């Protein structure tokens, strides 16, 4: 389950970092 | 992917930003 | 306030869960 | 879009699902 | 959607607070 | 319920603990 | 420890998935 | 229990729904 | 105020990722 | 403080960085 | 590795709720 | 510190309170 947990925190950080720009998440 | 990249070792917010639109 | 910003944080977590192996593309 | 639809009123897993890839 | 968002934080809090006892969560 | 007790004024640890099994 | 952290994401997932029915979290 | 089934391998939404009330 | 409590939880999350190994001391008041 | 600044308007990484140690 | 960065994220969230108005000096 | 202590084994709330100001 490690990878799945990491991705969850990774989207939260992209959301913060990327702002108005958004981001494509594509495992 | 970001996954292979940032779930193997810690990406900073500078590295993360490379993945923005 | 910053109600949208806070909501959006939760929405992305929800897409991450719902969309699964598929991923998703976020933009406001 | 999503923010205006899902942050003004609640979206279930059902209507979040189409916003996927 | 303030109640939904607040509810997400409260389940996170109950999880920490209740530990192996668990808790019931019903939004009524 | 907990939404009504805890989503306007902040519930303490003690108050939260009332909801555990 | 991995399981304790996983446990926190589970109850958030339950919260989202179960909607108005809710859920009873019992760990064991 | 859920911890054993879902914190060892990834649970799908269908699998999570089973633990709903 | 719970709105402030909720916003703080996100703020502490942000500062964790932004501050890196320097750390932070979260003060609301 | 951080609340007045960043709970009324969205703070950028740079504004938030001002509250690091 | 990334596991510590993830745990630390959960710890700060826990210390925010546990410590209340006292706060906490997070220093990694 | 906290990491060394609370990311090896699970800390209880009372243990986590050790790290409050
Ligand atoms: Cl985690
Ligand atoms: Cl929120
Ligand atoms: Zn929130
Ligand atoms: Zn986590």
Swiss-Prot record, chains C, K:
Changing residue 10 to D: In HPRI; Providence. This is Insulin B chain. The lineage of its organism: Eukaryota, Metazoa, Chordata, Craniata, Vertebrata.
């Amino acid at each position: 389950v490690n990878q799945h947990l990491c991705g969850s925190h990774l989207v939260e950080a992209l959301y913060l970092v990327c702002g108005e720009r958004g981001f494509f998440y594509t495992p | 992917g970001i996954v292979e990249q940032c779930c193997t070792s810690i990406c900073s917010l500078y590295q993360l930003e490379n993945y923005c639109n």
